[PDB]
């Protein structure tokens, strides 16, 4: 005992291997792409962003962060987002500014969706 100080010794601890699962339902992704992308904005200010900055405006879930948004637009419309700017509006909803990469034309995407 070269130390005059006693320390608690290191003891083995096993991991949890339960005899039954506490949850048996698999657990389903309730924040899927349809919850993330609710609907696009069609205001006059929102329509200007389409042809001026290659940008689509969406109303998004409050629980959706920027990473889920760009993954959602890719799985919904097969387009690539260059960047996503988000805000929470004074009405309490979340609004996303989705700028598409060059070689994606938001006006063509806007025509396919139906907002134009």
């Amino acid at each position: 005992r070269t130390s005059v100080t006693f320390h608690r010794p290191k003891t083995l601890s096993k991991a949890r291997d339960p005899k039954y699962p506490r949850i048996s339902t698999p657990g389903r992704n309730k924040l899927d792409q349809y919850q993330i992308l609710k609907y696009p904005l069609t205001t006059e200010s929102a329509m200007k962003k389409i042809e001026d900055n290659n940008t689509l405006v969406f109303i998004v879930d409050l629980k959706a962060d920027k990473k889920k948004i760009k993954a959602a637009v890719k799985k919904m419309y097969d387009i690539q987002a260059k960047k996503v700017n988000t805000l929470i509006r004074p009405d309490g909803k979340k609004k996303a500014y989705v700028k598409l990469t060059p070689d994606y034309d938001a006006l063509d995407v806007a025509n396919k969706i139906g907002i134009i």
Partner: protein, 221 residues
């Protein structure tokens, strides 16, 4: 090789830093270790009444190893052996066994019934009031008894832990002479001395430092 050389270090008060030492006696132990060590010291310092001090006198090592090697002959059957004996009887569809008796209530009953031929008492029954009266009862009933070290040793014989008392009522005819020689030695101690034993207190031993500093004061006279 001339390159090799000694590089001694002088370990003074303001000298080289000392190497790792044992430092065992200066270790600050957990509270559980400190309480059990102080409990041993307190029992040494406090005057121990004779009825408790008598458990300090234990069976001799030579006698104890003789008695236990004989107590091993009369071990009760283990759980598997009892199961096997049940099956063997069931195949026919026995004999009176000679085994050690144990359990404080059962041993106490045998002694008052005058059937105990030898009583073995453990020296470390933690509630000491369980067996503190036992040497008096065995001596009153004229029963040879001894105090041996280890309740866990007594427990091992009966396939338990901490038997705390063992009783022999019967011995085999192959062991009558050996059991009798054992019996007289256990009677010479523990039974014929019980009367003189009932007056010895023996519990006032001080610490080594306290002893050394009284010897000096005694030598200064």
């Amino acid at each position: 090789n001339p390159l090799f050389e000694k590089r001694p270090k002088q370990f003074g008060i303001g000298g080289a830093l000392p190497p790792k030492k044992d430092l065992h006696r200066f270790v600050k132990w957990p509270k559980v270790v400190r309480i059990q060590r102080q409990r041993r010291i307190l029992k040494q310092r406090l005057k121990v009444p004779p009825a408790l001090h008598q458990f300090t006198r234990t069976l001799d090592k030579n006698l104890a190893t003789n008695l236990f090697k004989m107590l091993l002959k009369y071990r009760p059957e283990d759980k598997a052996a009892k199961k096997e004996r049940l099956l063997k009887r069931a195949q026919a569809e026995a004999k009176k066994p000679i085994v050690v008796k144990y359990g404080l209530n059962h041993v106490t009953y045998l002694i008052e019934q005058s059937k105990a031929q030898l009583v073995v008492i453990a020296h470390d029954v933690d509630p000491i009031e369980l067996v503190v009266w036992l040497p008096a009862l065995c001596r009153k009933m004229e029963v040879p008894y001894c105090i041996v070290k280890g309740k866990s040793r007594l427990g091992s014989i009966v396939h338990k832990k901490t038997a705390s008392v063992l009783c022999l009522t019967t011995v085999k005819n192959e062991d009558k002479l050996e059991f009798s020689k054992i019996l007289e030695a256990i009677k010479a101690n523990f039974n014929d001395k019980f009367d003189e034993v009932r007056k010895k207190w023996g519990g006032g031993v001080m610490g080594s430092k306290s002893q050394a500093k009284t010897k000096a004061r005694e030598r200064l006279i």
